[PDB]
Amino acid sequence: KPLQVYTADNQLIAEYGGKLSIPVEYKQIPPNFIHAFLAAEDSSFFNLSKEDILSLYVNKIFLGKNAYGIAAAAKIYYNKSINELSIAQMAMIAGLPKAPSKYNPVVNPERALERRNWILGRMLQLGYISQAEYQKAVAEPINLNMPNRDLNNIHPYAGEMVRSELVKHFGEQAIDSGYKVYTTINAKRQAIAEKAVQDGLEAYDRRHGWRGAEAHDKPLSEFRAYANTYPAQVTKVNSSSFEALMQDGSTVTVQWSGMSWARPYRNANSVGAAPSRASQIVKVKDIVRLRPNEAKTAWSLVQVPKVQGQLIAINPNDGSIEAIVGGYNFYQSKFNRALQGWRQPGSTIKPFLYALALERGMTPYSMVNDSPITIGKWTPKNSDGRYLGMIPLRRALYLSRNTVSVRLLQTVGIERTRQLFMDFGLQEDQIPRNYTIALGTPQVLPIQMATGYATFANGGYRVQPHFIQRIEDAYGKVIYEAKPEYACIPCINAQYRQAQRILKSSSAYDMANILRDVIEHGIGRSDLGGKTGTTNDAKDAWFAGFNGKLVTVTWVGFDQPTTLGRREYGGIAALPIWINFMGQALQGTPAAWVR
């Protein structure tokens, strides 16, 4: 009866176990277990009387860690049936009822063993166990063999998105429901996004160079495989090749072509010279990451990036989350950068403020002033330190001119913009009450940016991102069906709630065409528009783009902001991920621009 997660293509991707109860008939209980409970307590005034009353609770008793009853405890703690438990394990379970958190083997192992051994000592005294049984049982370690009750190995960020969001809003009882959650996640598009982010971050990583082995003279057993990287121990180093021991005991050779890319990393802005020998890259006893080819006939030295990234893709008509990638790989941590990654948008915020200039009567052709500006003490300068004078609004956006954005902010007013940013999705207490908000200094989430860019793809409507299509109970009854706010109700036909208009149709179409011009003046599609973003000191690289059927926002940055390096702008780091995802997601679909 777990919480089951499906993709929009009816594939089960995840299963989340809640409170567990596995009832057993009383005659199925090994004698030593009942004895371990009979000996858990000093005295009973209900010794054969406790036996009759134990029979009424043996299946309901809270045994910590979502375990209700003896069988669920055997399963949760040891992955064993009640038959498989040892004297020591039976006494460990028998000691938990009194205080399952104070006596828990997971949180208090010391306190737990004190309790277990005493019960064993009291089992010995009662004649329940032999002296030999007691001697082994007391000497036995914790032996916890806790199975994973969170099956999430297909599209990890999609599965976790469901679990984590349910738990945040409805608490842990949300899992205990046994519901089937049918998401808006497209499994093909999700598989594409996962591969694209992985490739994008590795491309960035390799050009920034080899940072050395992740560990030296440490046990290989202590490392784990992920993102098609396999831990290995270097055993032999040759002039052009090295030998490594895999986690299965097999010895592999990595030839020159497999490691030659390994120029040493110096900093974000510097790599050393191409390596002239294998000895400059690896040491014997080093823990490296290898990747095989499809045939497994050749191996290469690979590297997990230190840089991070994310992708979020939504339908601009209804806000359906089609694909979501929260980091390089889910094994690293459960942290989802699309939903929780607060970062500065920089220039990706500019189309929002320029669309507000269009609301006021300006056209993409209207002349704007790119001349020096000073407000109070602050002198907003341009990233190139140049001033272009009278230029068209569209050129000013394309070139991301800070003085123009600052001047546009005064002409349109701060509150009017803050309100629009709030309309676009953005958080009220995250949007400052100053002029820096024309530069993309407020913190945003990639999902908010996707939501805001949808206003351009949909004709000026505010959509709300959503991941649930429908929910069923365990019996098959549909208990929830998504009723999103639609930008275009007749577009579903190719139904009920109409989304609110946040921009004039003409402002949205004008902005969409500027972004299309911005994309075409750098794949084989004429229905895409997009905007790059780079924060100060290249701490962030963004790409926010779309067609009329899909909005995609990509981001690249370090979790602890450090520069990505000069040369690492939006169009260089984030855009290739977007291009790779968009090109494959929109492959063999007609042109879909704005209505």
Q: Which residues bind its own copies (CB under 8 A)?
A: 37, 40-50, 52-54, 56-57, 60-62, 68, 97-98, 100, 125, 161, 165, 168-174, 177, 179, 321, 339, 425, 427-429, 445, 447, 464-468, 471, 479-480, 482-485, 497
Q: What residue is closest to ligand IM2 based on CB? A: 347
Contacts of 386 (CB under 8 A, 6+ apart): none
State how far the alpha carbon of 368 is from the alpha carbons of 21, 291, 405, 513, in Å: 69, 53, 10, 18
**Residue closer to ligand IM2, measured from CB, 175 or 541:** 541
Footprint of ligand IM2 on residues 417-446 (CB under 6 A)? 439-440
Angle of helix 446-457 relative to helix 505-520, nearest 10 degrees, comes to: 110
Q: Is 346 in the site for ligand IM2 (CB under 6 A)?
A: yes
From its own copies, ligand IM2, none, which one binds at residue 110 (CB under 5 to 8 Å depending on kind)? none
- Rule CB under 6 A: choose which of 143, 255, 340, 383 binds ligand IM2: 383
Give the per-residue contact string, 448-487, with ligand IM2 (x = CB under 6 A; - = no): ----------------------------------------
Ramachandran category for residue 66: left, alpha or beta (phi over 0 → left; psi -120 to 50 → alpha) = left
From ligand IM2, its own copies, none, which one binds at residue 439 (CB under 5 to 8 Å depending on kind)? ligand IM2
**How many residues sit in the footprint of ligand IM2 (CB under 6 A)?**
14
* Pairing status of strand 478-481 against strand 529-534: unpaired
Breaks (C-N over 2.5 A) in the chain follow: 46, 494, 522
Tokens encoding 566: 């000069």
From the list 416, 419, 424, the residue with the least C-alpha distance to 499 is 424
**Residue closer to its own copies, measured from CB, 230 or 352:** 352
- Measured CA to CA, the distance from residue 215 to residue 243 in angstroms comes to 17
Residue 294 in 3-state DSSP? coil
From ligand IM2, its own copies, none, which one binds at residue 40 (CB under 5 to 8 Å depending on kind)? its own copies
Q: Which residues pair with 472 in a beta bridge?
A: 180, 478
Per DSSP (E only), the strands in 221-280 are: 230-237, 242-246, 251-254, 265-267, 270-271
From ligand IM2, its own copies, none, which one binds at residue 400 (CB under 5 to 8 Å depending on kind)? ligand IM2
From the list 494, 495, 512, the residue with the least C-alpha distance to 503 is 512
Q: Among the residues of 79-155, which ranges form H helices?
A: 87-94, 109-125, 131-139
Please state the closest distance from residue 203 (CB atom) to its own copies, in A. Answer: 29
- Rule CB under 6 A: choose which of 570, 585, 592, 594 binds ligand IM2: 570
Residue 404 in 3-state DSSP? helix
- Rule CB under 6 A: choose which of 190, 229, 400, 417 binds ligand IM2: 400
Please state the closest distance from residue 411 (CB atom) to its own copies, in A. Answer: 27
Catalytic residue among 177, 320, 347, 507: 347
Ramachandran category for residue 236: left, alpha or beta (phi over 0 → left; psi -120 to 50 → alpha) = beta
- Rule CB under 6 A: choose which of 52, 114, 384, 473 binds ligand IM2: 384
Q: How many CB atoms lie within 10 A of CB 295?
A: 6
From the list 314, 316, 317, the residue with the least C-alpha distance to 495 is 317
**Residue closer to its own copies, measured from CB, 307 or 323:** 323
Stretch binding ligand IM2 (CB under 6 A), from 93-101, 513-521, 557-565, 568-576: 568-576
**Residue closer to ligand IM2, measured from CB, 52 or 384:** 384
Please state the closest distance from residue 199 (CB atom) to ligand IM2, in A. Answer: 21
Please state the closest distance from residue 111 (CB atom) to its own copies, in A. Answer: 16
From its own copies, ligand IM2, none, which one binds at residue 258 (CB under 5 to 8 Å depending on kind)? none
Please state the closest distance from residue 60 (CB atom) to its own copies, in A. Answer: 5
User: What is the distance of C-alpha 203 from the center of its chain?
Assistant: 20
Q: Is 95 in the site for ligand IM2 (CB under 6 A)?
A: no
Please state the closest distance from residue 109 (CB atom) to its own copies, in A. Answer: 20
- Rule CB under 6 A: choose which of 402, 507, 552, 580 binds ligand IM2: 402
Query: Would residue 366 show up in a list of annotated catalytic residues for this protein?
Result: no
- Measured CA to CA, the distance from residue 259 to residue 300 in angstroms comes to 6
Residue with token string 């989340």 = 16
Q: Are 493 and 505 in contact (CB under 8 A)?
A: no
**Residue closer to its own copies, measured from CB, 485 or 527:** 485
Give backbone dihedrals phi and psi of 378, rounded to 5 degrees, phi first: -65, 125
**Residue closer to its own copies, measured from CB, 95 or 529:** 95
Give the per-residue contact string, 503-542, with ligand IM2 (x = CB under 6 A; - = no): -----------------------------xxx--------
**Residue closer to ligand IM2, measured from CB, 3 or 412:** 412
Q: Is 351 in the site for ligand IM2 (CB under 6 A)?
A: no
Catalytic residue among 41, 51, 133, 243: 41
Burial 220-243 (b: 16+ CB within 10 A, else e): eeebeeebebbbbbbeebeeeebb
3-state secondary structure 361-430: CCCCCCEEEECCCCECCECCCCCCCCCCEEEEHHHHHHCCCHHHHHHHHHHHCHHHHHHHHHHHCCCHHH
- Measured CA to CA, the distance from residue 241 to residue 256 in angstroms comes to 6
Query: Would residue 405 show up in a list of annotated catalytic residues for this protein?
Result: no
Footprint of ligand IM2 on residues 247-276 (CB under 6 A)? none
- Rule CB under 6 A: choose which of 190, 310, 347, 403 binds ligand IM2: 347
Catalytic residues: 41, 347
Using CB under 6 A as the criterion, which residues of the chain lie in contact with ligand IM2 when the complex forms? 346-347, 383-384, 400, 402, 439-440, 532-534, 569-571
